[model samples]
Target: HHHHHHMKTSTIVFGGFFITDNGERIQIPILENPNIKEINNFFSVSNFEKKAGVLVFRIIPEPEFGNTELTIYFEKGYYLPIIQTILEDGDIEVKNLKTENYSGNTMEILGDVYPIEHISKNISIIQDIISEFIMKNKPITIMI
Candidate 1:
């Protein structure tokens, strides 16, 4: 007879486009294996209906470059226009959003990270980001 022992995991493969104001388009460059703990925490059940989730990254080889951040934003419908100032003029399809959450135990209940809106009577709102440096990953080509 056999039983359970150990196993492995494969992170999601995410790729997207980044179009500049000048109409120039470039592929959204991923950090490749973002922070393990941060990535895992992003799929929390609390944030299932959240508008966005952020994952931070640090560079060891190029320590001077500073940290990179990615803001995985979400909208209800598919292929929606990129109107958010924090986001660039780009679009991504359903097949591009690669996630193992539905298959993995972490976000199995949610099935996906798609944005879900909840109607509530609460008036208080929480802040999303608190930063001043202004340079990070999940970038959208900020113009200085």
Candidate 2:
């Protein structure tokens, strides 16, 4: 019963990068290749497809900083492929069963908090710091 219950829940993954060295950039100091890789590895998904960039998992941790920030973002359109097989058997709309919303660039789905964070550093201290911040946020469920 416990195992079954565990299987029913979803996990949240996060990725931060440093695209530029600008000091005034929002979420700056993050947006790098390593961070992207960490995001992909932790989420067990890919961040790119062909020439386009996509966060494969439908659910992920919020992208914010400080005390107040976005908790998670879910991508409804991107999630079809993941759940398609499970609800394809019968009279299930699938879409209507799960709720979705667009807070910003991605859709979000509420779920159990699966606190996870990724930084561009290979060091344990850096990863730990990021993870701690995620934990501090109280966690959130969002779509890809």
Candidate 3:
């Protein structure tokens, strides 16, 4: 008799860099903002889901280096938390980073989690990428 491994798999999509044969990474190619449908098309599936007015997604910029999860509160033009996780896939583990695992089905917090804009303090490389996307991708944001 054998037991089935309790695993739940989900699909994720994001636009980032592309590495070449000799190890050169290419940018995500879009210079102007495209609609969500267009993006999902390029990524080969639907990805973004806006909850009321809030949004949450991951940004895996370097592909080999690291990835950052950001929760965007669009109604107020702000954001919520950063979810850092170490995974088995190509997600290379980085030192001294905080992570939250499978919290999606958690009963940990019923009220709220405090807000912070400096979510990238732990990863400056991600910070630069976040800033780039913020300035180029969205409108103004009002933070806490």
Candidate 4:
């Protein structure tokens, strides 16, 4: 008789972030934004398929915190079709789409000038780096 112990491998799907059409990555401004209620609503809607794209959030932490920084990323090649679907749905208004200094598959989308634009954007492309770190199987940092 032989005994074998097999470990189950799993894939981690990072949430709270998404990719735009033009390539400009927009992450969830967690620590930013003062509208707690809105943030609650934004976070509660987990079922992305029913919503729009990544919410274009405005990061205005606090007065003492100083100038606000827009939580934006520039990763690529993660989620494309999802973004296109959002655009097709006409959920959020696209300000503009442009090409970057890279080769092919580079998109930079300037969404409507607003705080917390939509709900979801195209999925993929290292949506939220910190969030990605937070939603890991192993430990990373102390802060959440």
Give the best candidate by TM-score: 3
Worst 10-residue lDDT window for candidate 1 reads 75-84
Candidate 1 per-residue lDDT, tens place, 1-144, comes to 332322122222333443333545445445344443443344343333423222223222221122322233322112211111221222221211233444432221113433212211121111122122122333333358
In model 3, where do residues sit more than 4 Å from their true spots?
Answer: 1-52, 59-68, 87-144
RMSD of each: 17.1, 16.6, 17.1, 17.8
lDDT of each: 0.28, 0.28, 0.35, 0.32
lDDT string, candidate 4, 39-105, tens digits: 4455456444433344433321211221111233322321221121123333443332232443433
Q: Clash totals for all models, in order?
A: 1, 19, 0, 9
Q: How far off is residue 91 in model 4, in Å?
A: 32
Report how far residue 61 has shifted in candidate 2, in Å: 13
Error at 119, model 3, angstroms: 8.1
- Least accurate stretch of 10 residues (summed lDDT) in model 2? 76-85
RMSD of 4: 17.8
- Positional deviation of residue 38's Cα in model 1 after best superposition, in angstroms: 9.4
| Per-model TM against the reference | 0.22, 0.21, 0.25, 0.23
Instruction: Give me the runs in candidate 4 sitting further than 4 Å from their true place.
Output: 1-44, 61-67, 71-101, 106-127, 130-144
